[PDB]
Curated annotation (Swiss-Prot):
Organism placement in taxonomy: Eukaryota, Metazoa, Ecdysozoa, Arthropoda, Hexapoda
Entry-linked Gene3D superfamilies: 2.60.40.1360, Glycoside hydrolase 38, N terminal domain, Glycoside hydrolase family 38, central domain, Golgi alpha-mannosidase II, Golgi alpha-mannosidase II, domain 4
Gene expressing this chain: alpha-Man-IIa
Keyword annotations: Disulfide bond, Glycosidase, Golgi apparatus, Hydrolase, Membrane, Metal-binding, Signal-anchor, Transmembrane, Transmembrane helix, Zinc
Protein name, per record: Alpha-mannosidase 2
GO molecular function, one term: alpha-mannosidase activity
Amino acid sequence: CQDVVQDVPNVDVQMLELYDRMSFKDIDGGVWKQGWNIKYDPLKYNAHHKLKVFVVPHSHNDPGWIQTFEEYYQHDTKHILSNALRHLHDNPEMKFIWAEISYFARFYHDLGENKKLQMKSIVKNGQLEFVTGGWVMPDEANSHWRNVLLQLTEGQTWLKQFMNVTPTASWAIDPFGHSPTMPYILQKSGFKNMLIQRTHYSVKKELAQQRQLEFLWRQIWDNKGDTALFTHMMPFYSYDIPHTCGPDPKVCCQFDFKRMGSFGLSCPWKVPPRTISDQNVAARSDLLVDQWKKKAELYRTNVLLIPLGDDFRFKQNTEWDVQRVNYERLFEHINSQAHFNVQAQFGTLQEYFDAVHQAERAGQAEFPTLSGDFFTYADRSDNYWSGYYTSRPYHKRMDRVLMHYVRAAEMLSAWHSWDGMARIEERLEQARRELSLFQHHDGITGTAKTHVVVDYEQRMQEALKACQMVMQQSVYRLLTKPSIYSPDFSFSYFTLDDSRWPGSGVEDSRTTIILGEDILPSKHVVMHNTLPHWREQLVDFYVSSPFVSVTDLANNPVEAQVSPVWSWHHDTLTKTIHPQGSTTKYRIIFKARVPPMGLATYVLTISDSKPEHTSYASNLLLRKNPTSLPLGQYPEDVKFGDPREISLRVGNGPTLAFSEQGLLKSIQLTQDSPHVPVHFKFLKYGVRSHGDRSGAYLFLPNGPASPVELGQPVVLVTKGKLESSVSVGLPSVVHQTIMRGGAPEIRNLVDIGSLDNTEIVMRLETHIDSGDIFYTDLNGLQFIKRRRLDKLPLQANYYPIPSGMFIEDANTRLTLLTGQPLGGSSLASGELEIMQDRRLASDDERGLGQGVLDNKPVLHIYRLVLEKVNNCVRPSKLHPAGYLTSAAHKASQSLLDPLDKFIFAENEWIGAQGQFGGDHPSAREDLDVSVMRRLTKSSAKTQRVGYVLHRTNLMQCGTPEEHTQKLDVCHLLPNVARCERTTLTFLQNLEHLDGMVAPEVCPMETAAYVSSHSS
Ligand SMILES: O=C1N[C@H](CN[C@@H](CO)c2ccccc2)[C@@H](O)[C@H]1O
Ligand SMILES: *[C@@H]1O[C@H](CO)[C@@H](O)[C@H](O)[C@H]1NC(C)=O
Ligand SMILES: [Zn+2]
């Protein structure tokens, strides 16, 4: 295994180093506004050395943006694909590439068999070529790597089944900045080449000057280079025709033959296209070849890529004709005039890359190596696209919830083969496809129109219901005596109970367990643990009595805590935000212990008085002017006081001190250690009153943030043996700090209400001497070193925070883990900040045509980990990566993959069993079974189960921490007959494994295995 910590890779281009050196000046480059006037030597190409030009027709089809998926399908995409089939069929030299398989699958299934056969033939013969082959072209900033893999798999599995092809070239022309998670996944999925476009204009200029726009992109920790993937970065401002023929858009627009008038389009540079004729083809070809030769100066081989397309292009038959016929005339002229020394033709993306690598092999070019990322993107001036790291945060959080429910549903149902009448495969396919769709670069990004956001949300709600159905059917089967099991595949044996989605204050969605002497004495509940190690976690349920005790299913008592059910109210009469307690429902909390990838059953029983093993939290309401707070049968009376500082400690865990406004001020890790200053603060950013306005994409603040004016907020302190918390009703945020004995959990119920032109940020202020350095993650996969650059504006120093961020000095680290992707930064030494929501009246001129005024309450969740790191073995000062500690990684897992909770729906569960998975191996803490998916339906004689295994890398800090068992996924199901290593999509076998044993993977590696079973 390669060492991912101690060896700094030697690469030609390291993006953090590049950023430190670059000046980012925005000077007028001439017709290439962000470049320079490109010069070429006419004598470079000659009879013995021609320029080979591939013109690649394409159509960018957004799966929702200004219209919904289905609206675009009906109005645009079905016509594009129908006319592509016809025109490619009838014109054998024409070519076309296709990226978004969600649309292609929608189309193909509606085709008659004769047309399906015609479509298969133009794919098999190379005229129609799939590029990437994902369900979508995903966002790269907010997306979790697990969902990037999910959607890639969904599309490529479809393509293999129906088109008998698996793309090896990727096309990503529109995500708003680019992540190295993409080459990581793609290279482990059979890919050989990828293309990107939206990178900062200053990066394009710098790389173009050095001819470093084609590079071998490796991961930041990869010393050897085995992760490298050949990458082409496009050089200009857009993927549209004006910005793809060459550096002068006024010239290139004249070669977009859809712009002459009849189609409703024109050229903003005020020179229209003109139809190619024998009388103008020489002058037109002079202009076009000169653009091509200039573009070619930015690259190292004699093979040139010329994309030809734009959004929802190639719709009408007349458009196919006008582009094809005019380019054919140009090619006929150019290719017959030796003085140009050009051979130009329609091509596909794979054809381009094949010819590039033939030139490389012939010794014509050597390519540089590169590591790093391409955030934060700016397309022009100071217009940095950091807004969409936060826009529509409700749906960003929903993404992470659905991520986990898909994994849990696929895992729980994989243990068995299911009859078709159970509808398991059907529900899982629907769930995977709706989540996959949302990875689109107008879905999770929060950059679609209001009604499109609603469509995504409705789809994801259906997907959540599908997952719940599959999960509860699976639990019933896994925990019922087999000779008793009598399923009704339409019935709800269990309901899921989720304490954090949609969340307290967002939706009253949770069912109360109703117990009583005259109705029902007890109730079974079941917890699932999708992680491959034993896990303890506190779990809570709502119950109709405070007099409830917990037992395991050997009838052993389990210690429990009961707390009130508190609801925060924005009281329009008193003009205060204050909590009310229920007088009929209560929370019971207890520690569940659950096997690896397993299930554990508990029983909740009512009694007439306080049970022996159940304790009751105290409650203290700090406010001037209190009024009473009755709690029904709850046995401890609420106490009141004036606002004051408070301190709390649960178990042997840290001691946390809070201001009189209910906000953390210090953390003391152990009883004799310092009270380390750690202060939470809420602030607001505004919008500029002159110049460019923030919108769904762009963050254009009117200066540094200003503190929210808190007044004298109401603070609720709940103190229990198992769980304590401090909650405060601030303007726009009910902020909660929850303590269970380790790092606290932070929950913010964020309701930005009618605050127009406001962005609410949560900041942490510490005295950690972090200087200008901080760390953020990429797609939940890796942590990258960031350096704050005062030569760039504030918004340029914002980065995606898809799952966590940290700052550190020689001795101390503060890590904030998230349950949702949000934007954030460290704008000063010792600070961390993360945006909660943004409400923006204006459009930001990127095509959306609306502001962001559809905010709704969202429950954001976090873990806050303060640690001593002086004993940790860290990377050297020049290494571009960082790594979590064990405690921070487990805290992240606690947010993203919590225990699942199931409440038995009927009065008696006949045949109930106490546990599943007690014999599953408990794997080392850095290893995860990211995916477990049965790949065959029940009719297959040989069943196949796929696993994706990911090993992270955790710092060595002196904890001896060992004894675990080896996890061999190929023996998790009985009767194994073969074990194979596969690509991550499961679509290609890479190695037949001796002994049918799946080895574990190295740190920072991800592997896939498929086990086959004879029985
Ligand atoms: O958010 C998005 N931005 C892209 C914008 N495409 C460009 C045309 O190349 C466009 C800009 C403005 C209006 C319409 C279209 C869209 O593809 C969508 O994904
Ligand atoms: C699938 O494609 C391969 C060629 O890449 C071929 O060997 C096999 O026959 C194909 N099956 C078909 C044609 O459906
Ligand atoms: Zn797009």
